[PDB]
Amino acid sequence: LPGLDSQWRQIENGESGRERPLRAGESWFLVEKHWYKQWEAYVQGGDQDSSTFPGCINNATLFQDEINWRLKEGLVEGEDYVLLPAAAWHYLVSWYGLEHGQPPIERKVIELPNIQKVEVYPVELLLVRHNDLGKSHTVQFSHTDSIGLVLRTARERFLVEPQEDTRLWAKNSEGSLDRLYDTHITVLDAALETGQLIIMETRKKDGTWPSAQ
């Protein structure tokens, strides 16, 4: 079997383990809480031949029935079980092995229906140009609005000619900066907050961008 650090990093990393975002169609598996916590103790224990060896995966307290292997109901994530992506699960099974007679507990990700709601508190943003950070335009956007729309909005409110070249910057929190190069994601997909600063940047006649020398 791989090293402890190898197992841990293979199970707990993002996009290859537990910290994978939920994507529609992807399969996830269940591991009983105590077994997983024992595995965590073993891997983080600093010894491979320790007595904290979890052994075969055991989800006996998750099944209502031993004959049909029907999942118990009312089980909560974090309390009774822990979810593992297909990859990490397969690795665990290849390493420690599933208990004999037991089926893998597999479920899939689904996209819940779109809930409608009245947006009482829109994202109030202050639109600002690179050349004048004192001269601003306060505009309200929706959480579901696209960043391209925000770009066009800043372009409209500051009346910039189409021959001119513009880019979008976002001032996360109070000081932190982050470039906004994606024009196909929503405001909610941008971590924008009310009162935040959005800096629209226009290329100079030199062919240079104010941030790029």
Side-chain angles (χ1 to χ4, degrees), residues 1-63 65-69 71-171 173-203 206-213:
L1 298 189
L4 300 185
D5 173 81
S6 176
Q7 298 181 27
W8 170 264
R9 292 205 173 189
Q10 185 70 37
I11 301 299
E12 293 280 22
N13 52 14
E15 198 66 287
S16 176
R18 289 187 62 252
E19 295 303 323
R20 201 189 235 279
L22 294 183
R23 301 172 68 255
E26 288 190 350
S27 300
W28 291 70
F29 291 77
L30 280 70
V31 185
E32 195 274 332
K33 183 64 175 180
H34 293 343
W35 189 95
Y36 176 84
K37 291 302 292 182
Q38 277 298 115
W39 171 85
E40 183 179 8
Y42 170 70
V43 171
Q44 295 182 329
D47 196 329
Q48 301 95 330
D49 300 307
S50 180
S51 62
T52 61
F53 190 74
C56 297
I57 310 180
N58 195 347
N59 296 325
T61 59
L62 296 180
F63 298 106
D65 180 19
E66 196 91 299
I67 314 170
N68 282 284
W69 305 106
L71 184 68
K72 283 181 180 176
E73 57 285 346
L75 301 176
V76 186
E77 183 186 6
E79 167 170 339
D80 309 87
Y81 61 88
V82 177
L83 292 179
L84 275 178
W89 164 251
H90 223 194
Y91 276 111
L92 271 191
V93 171
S94 63
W95 299 337
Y96 296 85
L98 183 58
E99 191 140 79
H100 185 63
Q102 281 184 26
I105 308 178
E106 178 178 359
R107 297 288 182 277
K108 277 206 175 288
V109 179
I110 62 179
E111 284 187 333
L112 262 61
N114 310 61
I115 167 69
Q116 317 103 295
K117 194 188 78 169
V118 180
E119 186 176 279
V120 183
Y121 296 109
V123 186
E124 194 168 8
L125 300 174
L126 292 95
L127 305 183
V128 155
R129 286 187 91 177
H130 64 103
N131 49 286
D132 203 335
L133 285 56
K135 176 180 177 177
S136 57
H137 281 87
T138 298
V139 172
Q140 287 183 339
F141 293 95
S142 180
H143 297 90
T144 64
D145 280 355
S146 178
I147 305 197
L149 176 59
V150 181
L151 175 73
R152 293 189 272 269
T153 308
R155 284 203 105 183
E156 291 171 9
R157 214 55 58 100
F158 286 103
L159 301 168
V160 299
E161 292 157 22
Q163 55 173 335
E164 298 176 339
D165 323 315
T166 59
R167 293 175 175 179
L168 264 195
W169 295 78
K171 186 165 159 294
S173 64
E174 296 69 49
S176 297
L177 286 178
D178 193 20
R179 172 78 160 82
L180 276 182
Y181 32 48
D182 198 339
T183 169
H184 289 128
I185 56 178
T186 180
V187 172
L188 184 58
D189 289 333
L192 302 187
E193 276 202 47
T194 173
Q196 278 193 4
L197 197 68
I198 291 81
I199 305 175
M200 185 182 65
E201 182 201 7
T202 301
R203 175 184 275 201
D206 308 342
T208 64
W209 295 90
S211 58
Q213 176 104 29

mmCIF file with all atom_site columns, all heavy atoms in Angstrom, residues 60-85, unseen atoms left out:
data_model
loop_
_atom_site.group_PDB
_atom_site.id
_atom_site.type_symbol
_atom_site.label_atom_id
_atom_site.label_alt_id
_atom_site.label_comp_id
_atom_site.label_asym_id
_atom_site.label_entity_id
_atom_site.label_seq_id
_atom_site.pdbx_PDB_ins_code
_atom_site.Cartn_x
_atom_site.Cartn_y
_atom_site.Cartn_z
_atom_site.occupancy
_atom_site.B_iso_or_equiv
_atom_site.pdbx_formal_charge
_atom_site.auth_seq_id
_atom_site.auth_comp_id
_atom_site.auth_asym_id
_atom_site.auth_atom_id
_atom_site.pdbx_PDB_model_num
ATOM 1   N N   . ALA A 1 60 ? -21.535 -1.408  8.562  1.00 0.00 ? 60 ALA A N   1
ATOM 2   C CA  . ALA A 1 60 ? -22.613 -2.247  9.080  1.00 0.00 ? 60 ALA A CA  1
ATOM 3   C C   . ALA A 1 60 ? -23.706 -1.440  9.775  1.00 0.00 ? 60 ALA A C   1
ATOM 4   O O   . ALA A 1 60 ? -24.877 -1.820  9.747  1.00 0.00 ? 60 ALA A O   1
ATOM 5   C CB  . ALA A 1 60 ? -22.052 -3.291  10.033 1.00 0.00 ? 60 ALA A CB  1
ATOM 6   N N   . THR A 1 61 ? -23.325 -0.329  10.397 1.00 0.00 ? 61 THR A N   1
ATOM 7   C CA  . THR A 1 61 ? -24.281 0.487   11.138 1.00 0.00 ? 61 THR A CA  1
ATOM 8   C C   . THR A 1 61 ? -25.010 1.472   10.231 1.00 0.00 ? 61 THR A C   1
ATOM 9   O O   . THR A 1 61 ? -25.729 2.351   10.705 1.00 0.00 ? 61 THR A O   1
ATOM 10  C CB  . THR A 1 61 ? -23.594 1.266   12.275 1.00 0.00 ? 61 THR A CB  1
ATOM 11  O OG1 . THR A 1 61 ? -22.582 2.121   11.730 1.00 0.00 ? 61 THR A OG1 1
ATOM 12  C CG2 . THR A 1 61 ? -22.961 0.305   13.270 1.00 0.00 ? 61 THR A CG2 1
ATOM 13  N N   . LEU A 1 62 ? -24.824 1.321   8.924  1.00 0.00 ? 62 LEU A N   1
ATOM 14  C CA  . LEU A 1 62 ? -25.498 2.176   7.955  1.00 0.00 ? 62 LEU A CA  1
ATOM 15  C C   . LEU A 1 62 ? -26.644 1.437   7.275  1.00 0.00 ? 62 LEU A C   1
ATOM 16  O O   . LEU A 1 62 ? -27.528 2.054   6.682  1.00 0.00 ? 62 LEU A O   1
ATOM 17  C CB  . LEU A 1 62 ? -24.510 2.689   6.905  1.00 0.00 ? 62 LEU A CB  1
ATOM 18  C CG  . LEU A 1 62 ? -23.388 3.608   7.390  1.00 0.00 ? 62 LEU A CG  1
ATOM 19  C CD1 . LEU A 1 62 ? -22.496 4.016   6.228  1.00 0.00 ? 62 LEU A CD1 1
ATOM 20  C CD2 . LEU A 1 62 ? -23.958 4.833   8.086  1.00 0.00 ? 62 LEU A CD2 1
ATOM 21  N N   . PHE A 1 63 ? -26.625 0.112   7.365  1.00 0.00 ? 63 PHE A N   1
ATOM 22  C CA  . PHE A 1 63 ? -27.650 -0.704  6.728  1.00 0.00 ? 63 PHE A CA  1
ATOM 23  C C   . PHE A 1 63 ? -28.781 -1.027  7.696  1.00 0.00 ? 63 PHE A C   1
ATOM 24  O O   . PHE A 1 63 ? -28.544 -1.434  8.833  1.00 0.00 ? 63 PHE A O   1
ATOM 25  C CB  . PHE A 1 63 ? -27.048 -2.000  6.181  1.00 0.00 ? 63 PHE A CB  1
ATOM 26  C CG  . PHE A 1 63 ? -26.011 -1.788  5.115  1.00 0.00 ? 63 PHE A CG  1
ATOM 27  C CD1 . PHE A 1 63 ? -24.668 -1.978  5.390  1.00 0.00 ? 63 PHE A CD1 1
ATOM 28  C CD2 . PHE A 1 63 ? -26.379 -1.409  3.835  1.00 0.00 ? 63 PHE A CD2 1
ATOM 29  C CE1 . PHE A 1 63 ? -23.710 -1.786  4.413  1.00 0.00 ? 63 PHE A CE1 1
ATOM 30  C CE2 . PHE A 1 63 ? -25.426 -1.216  2.851  1.00 0.00 ? 63 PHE A CE2 1
ATOM 31  C CZ  . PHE A 1 63 ? -24.090 -1.405  3.141  1.00 0.00 ? 63 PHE A CZ  1
ATOM 32  N N   . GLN A 1 64 ? -30.013 -0.848  7.231  1.00 0.00 ? 64 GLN A N   1
ATOM 33  C CA  . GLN A 1 64 ? -31.187 -1.220  8.008  1.00 0.00 ? 64 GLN A CA  1
ATOM 34  C C   . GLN A 1 64 ? -31.297 -2.736  8.055  1.00 0.00 ? 64 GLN A C   1
ATOM 35  O O   . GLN A 1 64 ? -31.754 -3.310  9.042  1.00 0.00 ? 64 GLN A O   1
ATOM 36  C CB  . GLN A 1 64 ? -32.454 -0.607  7.412  1.00 0.00 ? 64 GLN A CB  1
ATOM 37  N N   . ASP A 1 65 ? -30.868 -3.376  6.974  1.00 0.00 ? 65 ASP A N   1
ATOM 38  C CA  . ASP A 1 65 ? -31.008 -4.815  6.827  1.00 0.00 ? 65 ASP A CA  1
ATOM 39  C C   . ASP A 1 65 ? -29.682 -5.436  6.403  1.00 0.00 ? 65 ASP A C   1
ATOM 40  O O   . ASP A 1 65 ? -28.933 -4.858  5.617  1.00 0.00 ? 65 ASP A O   1
ATOM 41  C CB  . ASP A 1 65 ? -32.100 -5.142  5.804  1.00 0.00 ? 65 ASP A CB  1
ATOM 42  C CG  . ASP A 1 65 ? -32.291 -6.633  5.606  1.00 0.00 ? 65 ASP A CG  1
ATOM 43  O OD1 . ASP A 1 65 ? -31.864 -7.417  6.479  1.00 0.00 ? 65 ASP A OD1 1
ATOM 44  O OD2 . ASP A 1 65 ? -32.868 -7.024  4.569  1.00 0.00 ? 65 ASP A OD2 1
ATOM 45  N N   . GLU A 1 66 ? -29.403 -6.622  6.934  1.00 0.00 ? 66 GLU A N   1
ATOM 46  C CA  . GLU A 1 66 ? -28.167 -7.334  6.642  1.00 0.00 ? 66 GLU A CA  1
ATOM 47  C C   . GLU A 1 66 ? -28.366 -8.261  5.446  1.00 0.00 ? 66 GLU A C   1
ATOM 48  O O   . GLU A 1 66 ? -27.403 -8.747  4.854  1.00 0.00 ? 66 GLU A O   1
ATOM 49  C CB  . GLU A 1 66 ? -27.709 -8.132  7.868  1.00 0.00 ? 66 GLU A CB  1
ATOM 50  C CG  . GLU A 1 66 ? -26.264 -8.611  7.823  1.00 0.00 ? 66 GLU A CG  1
ATOM 51  C CD  . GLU A 1 66 ? -25.295 -7.620  8.442  1.00 0.00 ? 66 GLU A CD  1
ATOM 52  O OE1 . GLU A 1 66 ? -25.206 -6.479  7.945  1.00 0.00 ? 66 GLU A OE1 1
ATOM 53  O OE2 . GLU A 1 66 ? -24.619 -7.988  9.427  1.00 0.00 ? 66 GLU A OE2 1
ATOM 54  N N   . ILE A 1 67 ? -29.625 -8.487  5.088  1.00 0.00 ? 67 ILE A N   1
ATOM 55  C CA  . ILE A 1 67 ? -29.967 -9.432  4.031  1.00 0.00 ? 67 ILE A CA  1
ATOM 56  C C   . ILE A 1 67 ? -30.195 -8.750  2.682  1.00 0.00 ? 67 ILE A C   1
ATOM 57  O O   . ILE A 1 67 ? -29.852 -9.299  1.635  1.00 0.00 ? 67 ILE A O   1
ATOM 58  C CB  . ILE A 1 67 ? -31.235 -10.229 4.408  1.00 0.00 ? 67 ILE A CB  1
ATOM 59  C CG1 . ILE A 1 67 ? -31.141 -10.721 5.855  1.00 0.00 ? 67 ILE A CG1 1
ATOM 60  C CG2 . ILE A 1 67 ? -31.460 -11.384 3.443  1.00 0.00 ? 67 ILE A CG2 1
ATOM 61  C CD1 . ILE A 1 67 ? -32.431 -11.302 6.393  1.00 0.00 ? 67 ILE A CD1 1
ATOM 62  N N   . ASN A 1 68 ? -30.764 -7.550  2.711  1.00 0.00 ? 68 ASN A N   1
ATOM 63  C CA  . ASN A 1 68 ? -30.997 -6.790  1.487  1.00 0.00 ? 68 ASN A CA  1
ATOM 64  C C   . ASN A 1 68 ? -30.039 -5.622  1.333  1.00 0.00 ? 68 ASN A C   1
ATOM 65  O O   . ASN A 1 68 ? -29.939 -5.033  0.256  1.00 0.00 ? 68 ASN A O   1
ATOM 66  C CB  . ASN A 1 68 ? -32.435 -6.279  1.433  1.00 0.00 ? 68 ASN A CB  1
ATOM 67  C CG  . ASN A 1 68 ? -33.413 -7.358  1.042  1.00 0.00 ? 68 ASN A CG  1
ATOM 68  O OD1 . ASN A 1 68 ? -33.500 -7.731  -0.126 1.00 0.00 ? 68 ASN A OD1 1
ATOM 69  N ND2 . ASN A 1 68 ? -34.162 -7.863  2.014  1.00 0.00 ? 68 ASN A ND2 1
ATOM 70  N N   . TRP A 1 69 ? -29.342 -5.300  2.419  1.00 0.00 ? 69 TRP A N   1
ATOM 71  C CA  . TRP A 1 69 ? -28.423 -4.168  2.457  1.00 0.00 ? 69 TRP A CA  1
ATOM 72  C C   . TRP A 1 69 ? -29.140 -2.888  2.050  1.00 0.00 ? 69 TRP A C   1
ATOM 73  O O   . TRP A 1 69 ? -28.710 -2.178  1.140  1.00 0.00 ? 69 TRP A O   1
ATOM 74  C CB  . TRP A 1 69 ? -27.213 -4.417  1.554  1.00 0.00 ? 69 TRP A CB  1
ATOM 75  C CG  . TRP A 1 69 ? -26.496 -5.690  1.869  1.00 0.00 ? 69 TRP A CG  1
ATOM 76  C CD1 . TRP A 1 69 ? -26.510 -6.842  1.140  1.00 0.00 ? 69 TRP A CD1 1
ATOM 77  C CD2 . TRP A 1 69 ? -25.656 -5.942  3.002  1.00 0.00 ? 69 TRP A CD2 1
ATOM 78  N NE1 . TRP A 1 69 ? -25.731 -7.798  1.749  1.00 0.00 ? 69 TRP A NE1 1
ATOM 79  C CE2 . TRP A 1 69 ? -25.196 -7.268  2.894  1.00 0.00 ? 69 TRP A CE2 1
ATOM 80  C CE3 . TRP A 1 69 ? -25.250 -5.173  4.097  1.00 0.00 ? 69 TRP A CE3 1
ATOM 81  C CZ2 . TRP A 1 69 ? -24.349 -7.844  3.840  1.00 0.00 ? 69 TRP A CZ2 1
ATOM 82  C CZ3 . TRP A 1 69 ? -24.409 -5.746  5.034  1.00 0.00 ? 69 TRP A CZ3 1
ATOM 83  C CH2 . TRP A 1 69 ? -23.968 -7.068  4.899  1.00 0.00 ? 69 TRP A CH2 1
ATOM 84  N N   . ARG A 1 70 ? -30.243 -2.606  2.734  1.00 0.00 ? 70 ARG A N   1
ATOM 85  C CA  . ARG A 1 70 ? -30.990 -1.384  2.495  1.00 0.00 ? 70 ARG A CA  1
ATOM 86  C C   . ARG A 1 70 ? -30.480 -0.321  3.452  1.00 0.00 ? 70 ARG A C   1
ATOM 87  O O   . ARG A 1 70 ? -30.334 -0.568  4.650  1.00 0.00 ? 70 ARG A O   1
ATOM 88  C CB  . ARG A 1 70 ? -32.492 -1.610  2.681  1.00 0.00 ? 70 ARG A CB  1
ATOM 89  N N   . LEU A 1 71 ? -30.210 0.863   2.917  1.00 0.00 ? 71 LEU A N   1
ATOM 90  C CA  . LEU A 1 71 ? -29.626 1.942   3.700  1.00 0.00 ? 71 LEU A CA  1
ATOM 91  C C   . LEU A 1 71 ? -30.582 2.433   4.780  1.00 0.00 ? 71 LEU A C   1
ATOM 92  O O   . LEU A 1 71 ? -31.779 2.592   4.537  1.00 0.00 ? 71 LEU A O   1
ATOM 93  C CB  . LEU A 1 71 ? -29.223 3.100   2.786  1.00 0.00 ? 71 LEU A CB  1
ATOM 94  C CG  . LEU A 1 71 ? -28.512 4.279   3.453  1.00 0.00 ? 71 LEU A CG  1
ATOM 95  C CD1 . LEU A 1 71 ? -27.131 3.865   3.934  1.00 0.00 ? 71 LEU A CD1 1
ATOM 96  C CD2 . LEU A 1 71 ? -28.423 5.457   2.498  1.00 0.00 ? 71 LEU A CD2 1
ATOM 97  N N   . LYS A 1 72 ? -30.047 2.665   5.975  1.00 0.00 ? 72 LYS A N   1
ATOM 98  C CA  . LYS A 1 72 ? -30.833 3.259   7.046  1.00 0.00 ? 72 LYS A CA  1
ATOM 99  C C   . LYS A 1 72 ? -31.262 4.663   6.661  1.00 0.00 ? 72 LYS A C   1
ATOM 100 O O   . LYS A 1 72 ? -30.580 5.350   5.900  1.00 0.00 ? 72 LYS A O   1
ATOM 101 C CB  . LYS A 1 72 ? -30.051 3.298   8.362  1.00 0.00 ? 72 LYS A CB  1
ATOM 102 C CG  . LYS A 1 72 ? -29.965 1.969   9.087  1.00 0.00 ? 72 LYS A CG  1
ATOM 103 C CD  . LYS A 1 72 ? -29.189 2.102   10.388 1.00 0.00 ? 72 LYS A CD  1
ATOM 104 C CE  . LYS A 1 72 ? -29.107 0.773   11.122 1.00 0.00 ? 72 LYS A CE  1
ATOM 105 N NZ  . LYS A 1 72 ? -28.262 0.861   12.347 1.00 0.00 ? 72 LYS A NZ  1
ATOM 106 N N   . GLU A 1 73 ? -32.406 5.078   7.190  1.00 0.00 ? 73 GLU A N   1
ATOM 107 C CA  . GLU A 1 73 ? -32.987 6.368   6.861  1.00 0.00 ? 73 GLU A CA  1
ATOM 108 C C   . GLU A 1 73 ? -32.755 7.346   8.003  1.00 0.00 ? 73 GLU A C   1
ATOM 109 O O   . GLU A 1 73 ? -32.647 6.942   9.161  1.00 0.00 ? 73 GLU A O   1
ATOM 110 C CB  . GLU A 1 73 ? -34.485 6.226   6.569  1.00 0.00 ? 73 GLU A CB  1
ATOM 111 C CG  . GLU A 1 73 ? -35.299 5.601   7.705  1.00 0.00 ? 73 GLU A CG  1
ATOM 112 C CD  . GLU A 1 73 ? -35.093 4.099   7.833  1.00 0.00 ? 73 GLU A CD  1
ATOM 113 O OE1 . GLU A 1 73 ? -34.539 3.490   6.893  1.00 0.00 ? 73 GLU A OE1 1
ATOM 114 O OE2 . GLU A 1 73 ? -35.473 3.530   8.877  1.00 0.00 ? 73 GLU A OE2 1
ATOM 115 N N   . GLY A 1 74 ? -32.673 8.631   7.677  1.00 0.00 ? 74 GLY A N   1
ATOM 116 C CA  . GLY A 1 74 ? -32.472 9.645   8.692  1.00 0.00 ? 74 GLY A CA  1
ATOM 117 C C   . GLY A 1 74 ? -31.001 9.884   8.972  1.00 0.00 ? 74 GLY A C   1
ATOM 118 O O   . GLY A 1 74 ? -30.648 10.670  9.851  1.00 0.00 ? 74 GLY A O   1
ATOM 119 N N   . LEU A 1 75 ? -30.139 9.205   8.221  1.00 0.00 ? 75 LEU A N   1
ATOM 120 C CA  . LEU A 1 75 ? -28.700 9.345   8.404  1.00 0.00 ? 75 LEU A CA  1
ATOM 121 C C   . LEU A 1 75 ? -28.225 10.692  7.878  1.00 0.00 ? 75 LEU A C   1
ATOM 122 O O   . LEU A 1 75 ? -28.619 11.123  6.795  1.00 0.00 ? 75 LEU A O   1
ATOM 123 C CB  . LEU A 1 75 ? -27.952 8.213   7.696  1.00 0.00 ? 75 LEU A CB  1
ATOM 124 C CG  . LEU A 1 75 ? -28.283 6.779   8.112  1.00 0.00 ? 75 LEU A CG  1
ATOM 125 C CD1 . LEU A 1 75 ? -27.527 5.781   7.247  1.00 0.00 ? 75 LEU A CD1 1
ATOM 126 C CD2 . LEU A 1 75 ? -27.966 6.563   9.583  1.00 0.00 ? 75 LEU A CD2 1
ATOM 127 N N   . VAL A 1 76 ? -27.363 11.349  8.649  1.00 0.00 ? 76 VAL A N   1
ATOM 128 C CA  . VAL A 1 76 ? -26.907 12.689  8.308  1.00 0.00 ? 76 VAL A CA  1
ATOM 129 C C   . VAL A 1 76 ? -25.427 12.685  7.942  1.00 0.00 ? 76 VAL A C   1
ATOM 130 O O   . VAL A 1 76 ? -24.635 11.956  8.540  1.00 0.00 ? 76 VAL A O   1
ATOM 131 C CB  . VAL A 1 76 ? -27.140 13.667  9.484  1.00 0.00 ? 76 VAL A CB  1
ATOM 132 C CG1 . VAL A 1 76 ? -26.812 15.098  9.079  1.00 0.00 ? 76 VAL A CG1 1
ATOM 133 C CG2 . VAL A 1 76 ? -28.573 13.566  9.980  1.00 0.00 ? 76 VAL A CG2 1
ATOM 134 N N   . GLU A 1 77 ? -25.060 13.500  6.960  1.00 0.00 ? 77 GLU A N   1
ATOM 135 C CA  . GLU A 1 77 ? -23.669 13.618  6.551  1.00 0.00 ? 77 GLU A CA  1
ATOM 136 C C   . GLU A 1 77 ? -22.881 14.307  7.659  1.00 0.00 ? 77 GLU A C   1
ATOM 137 O O   . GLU A 1 77 ? -23.340 15.295  8.232  1.00 0.00 ? 77 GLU A O   1
ATOM 138 C CB  . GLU A 1 77 ? -23.558 14.393  5.236  1.00 0.00 ? 77 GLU A CB  1
ATOM 139 C CG  . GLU A 1 77 ? -22.148 14.515  4.688  1.00 0.00 ? 77 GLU A CG  1
ATOM 140 C CD  . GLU A 1 77 ? -22.081 15.404  3.461  1.00 0.00 ? 77 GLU A CD  1
ATOM 141 O OE1 . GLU A 1 77 ? -23.110 16.019  3.112  1.00 0.00 ? 77 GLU A OE1 1
ATOM 142 O OE2 . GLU A 1 77 ? -20.997 15.488  2.844  1.00 0.00 ? 77 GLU A OE2 1
ATOM 143 N N   . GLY A 1 78 ? -21.698 13.785  7.964  1.00 0.00 ? 78 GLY A N   1
ATOM 144 C CA  . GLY A 1 78 ? -20.880 14.356  9.015  1.00 0.00 ? 78 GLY A CA  1
ATOM 145 C C   . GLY A 1 78 ? -21.094 13.651  10.341 1.00 0.00 ? 78 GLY A C   1
ATOM 146 O O   . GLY A 1 78 ? -20.184 13.565  11.166 1.00 0.00 ? 78 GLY A O   1
ATOM 147 N N   . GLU A 1 79 ? -22.307 13.146  10.546 1.00 0.00 ? 79 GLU A N   1
ATOM 148 C CA  . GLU A 1 79 ? -22.652 12.462  11.787 1.00 0.00 ? 79 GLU A CA  1
ATOM 149 C C   . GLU A 1 79 ? -22.548 10.946  11.670 1.00 0.00 ? 79 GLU A C   1
ATOM 150 O O   . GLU A 1 79 ? -21.866 10.298  12.463 1.00 0.00 ? 79 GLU A O   1
ATOM 151 C CB  . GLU A 1 79 ? -24.071 12.840  12.219 1.00 0.00 ? 79 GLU A CB  1
ATOM 152 C CG  . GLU A 1 79 ? -24.638 11.950  13.315 1.00 0.00 ? 79 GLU A CG  1
ATOM 153 C CD  . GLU A 1 79 ? -25.938 12.478  13.884 1.00 0.00 ? 79 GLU A CD  1
ATOM 154 O OE1 . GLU A 1 79 ? -26.208 13.688  13.733 1.00 0.00 ? 79 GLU A OE1 1
ATOM 155 O OE2 . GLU A 1 79 ? -26.688 11.684  14.489 1.00 0.00 ? 79 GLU A OE2 1
ATOM 156 N N   . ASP A 1 80 ? -23.224 10.388  10.672 1.00 0.00 ? 80 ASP A N   1
ATOM 157 C CA  . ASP A 1 80 ? -23.284 8.942   10.506 1.00 0.00 ? 80 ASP A CA  1
ATOM 158 C C   . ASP A 1 80 ? -22.288 8.467   9.461  1.00 0.00 ? 80 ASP A C   1
ATOM 159 O O   . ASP A 1 80 ? -21.633 7.439   9.634  1.00 0.00 ? 80 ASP A O   1
ATOM 160 C CB  . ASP A 1 80 ? -24.699 8.506   10.119 1.00 0.00 ? 80 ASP A CB  1
ATOM 161 C CG  . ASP A 1 80 ? -25.757 9.074   11.043 1.00 0.00 ? 80 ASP A CG  1
ATOM 162 O OD1 . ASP A 1 80 ? -26.229 10.202  10.788 1.00 0.00 ? 80 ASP A OD1 1
ATOM 163 O OD2 . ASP A 1 80 ? -26.118 8.391   12.024 1.00 0.00 ? 80 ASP A OD2 1
ATOM 164 N N   . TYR A 1 81 ? -22.180 9.221   8.372  1.00 0.00 ? 81 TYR A N   1
ATOM 165 C CA  . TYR A 1 81 ? -21.283 8.856   7.285  1.00 0.00 ? 81 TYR A CA  1
ATOM 166 C C   . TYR A 1 81 ? -20.459 10.031  6.767  1.00 0.00 ? 81 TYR A C   1
ATOM 167 O O   . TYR A 1 81 ? -20.585 11.158  7.242  1.00 0.00 ? 81 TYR A O   1
ATOM 168 C CB  . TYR A 1 81 ? -22.085 8.239   6.134  1.00 0.00 ? 81 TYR A CB  1
ATOM 169 C CG  . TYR A 1 81 ? -23.117 9.170   5.531  1.00 0.00 ? 81 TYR A CG  1
ATOM 170 C CD1 . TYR A 1 81 ? -22.787 10.034  4.493  1.00 0.00 ? 81 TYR A CD1 1
ATOM 171 C CD2 . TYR A 1 81 ? -24.424 9.185   6.003  1.00 0.00 ? 81 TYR A CD2 1
ATOM 172 C CE1 . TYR A 1 81 ? -23.729 10.885  3.945  1.00 0.00 ? 81 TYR A CE1 1
ATOM 173 C CE2 . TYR A 1 81 ? -25.372 10.031  5.460  1.00 0.00 ? 81 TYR A CE2 1
ATOM 174 C CZ  . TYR A 1 81 ? -25.019 10.879  4.432  1.00 0.00 ? 81 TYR A CZ  1
ATOM 175 O OH  . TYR A 1 81 ? -25.964 11.722  3.892  1.00 0.00 ? 81 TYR A OH  1
ATOM 176 N N   . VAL A 1 82 ? -19.624 9.739   5.773  1.00 0.00 ? 82 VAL A N   1
ATOM 177 C CA  . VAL A 1 82 ? -18.762 10.715  5.117  1.00 0.00 ? 82 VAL A CA  1
ATOM 178 C C   . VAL A 1 82 ? -18.739 10.382  3.629  1.00 0.00 ? 82 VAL A C   1
ATOM 179 O O   . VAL A 1 82 ? -18.639 9.210   3.252  1.00 0.00 ? 82 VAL A O   1
ATOM 180 C CB  . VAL A 1 82 ? -17.320 10.705  5.680  1.00 0.00 ? 82 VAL A CB  1
ATOM 181 C CG1 . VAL A 1 82 ? -16.440 11.691  4.924  1.00 0.00 ? 82 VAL A CG1 1
ATOM 182 C CG2 . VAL A 1 82 ? -17.310 11.019  7.171  1.00 0.00 ? 82 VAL A CG2 1
ATOM 183 N N   . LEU A 1 83 ? -18.839 11.407  2.789  1.00 0.00 ? 83 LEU A N   1
ATOM 184 C CA  . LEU A 1 83 ? -18.891 11.207  1.345  1.00 0.00 ? 83 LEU A CA  1
ATOM 185 C C   . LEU A 1 83 ? -17.510 11.241  0.701  1.00 0.00 ? 83 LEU A C   1
ATOM 186 O O   . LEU A 1 83 ? -16.667 12.072  1.039  1.00 0.00 ? 83 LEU A O   1
ATOM 187 C CB  . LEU A 1 83 ? -19.791 12.257  0.694  1.00 0.00 ? 83 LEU A CB  1
ATOM 188 C CG  . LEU A 1 83 ? -21.280 12.153  1.024  1.00 0.00 ? 83 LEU A CG  1
ATOM 189 C CD1 . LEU A 1 83 ? -22.065 13.267  0.351  1.00 0.00 ? 83 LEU A CD1 1
ATOM 190 C CD2 . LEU A 1 83 ? -21.816 10.793  0.615  1.00 0.00 ? 83 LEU A CD2 1
ATOM 191 N N   . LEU A 1 84 ? -17.295 10.322  -0.234 1.00 0.00 ? 84 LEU A N   1
ATOM 192 C CA  . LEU A 1 84 ? -16.037 10.211  -0.958 1.00 0.00 ? 84 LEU A CA  1
ATOM 193 C C   . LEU A 1 84 ? -16.284 10.081  -2.456 1.00 0.00 ? 84 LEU A C   1
ATOM 194 O O   . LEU A 1 84 ? -17.100 9.271   -2.877 1.00 0.00 ? 84 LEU A O   1
ATOM 195 C CB  . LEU A 1 84 ? -15.244 9.007   -0.449 1.00 0.00 ? 84 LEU A CB  1
ATOM 196 C CG  . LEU A 1 84 ? -14.377 9.231   0.786  1.00 0.00 ? 84 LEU A CG  1
ATOM 197 C CD1 . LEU A 1 84 ? -13.700 7.948   1.185  1.00 0.00 ? 84 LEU A CD1 1
ATOM 198 C CD2 . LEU A 1 84 ? -13.338 10.274  0.468  1.00 0.00 ? 84 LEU A CD2 1
ATOM 199 N N   . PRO A 1 85 ? -15.571 10.872  -3.271 1.00 0.00 ? 85 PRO A N   1
ATOM 200 C CA  . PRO A 1 85 ? -15.735 10.767  -4.725 1.00 0.00 ? 85 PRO A CA  1
ATOM 201 C C   . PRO A 1 85 ? -15.372 9.375   -5.243 1.00 0.00 ? 85 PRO A C   1
ATOM 202 O O   . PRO A 1 85 ? -14.719 8.613   -4.529 1.00 0.00 ? 85 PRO A O   1
ATOM 203 C CB  . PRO A 1 85 ? -14.773 11.828  -5.268 1.00 0.00 ? 85 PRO A CB  1
ATOM 204 C CG  . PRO A 1 85 ? -13.776 12.031  -4.177 1.00 0.00 ? 85 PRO A CG  1
ATOM 205 C CD  . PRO A 1 85 ? -14.541 11.857  -2.901 1.00 0.00 ? 85 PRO A CD  1
#
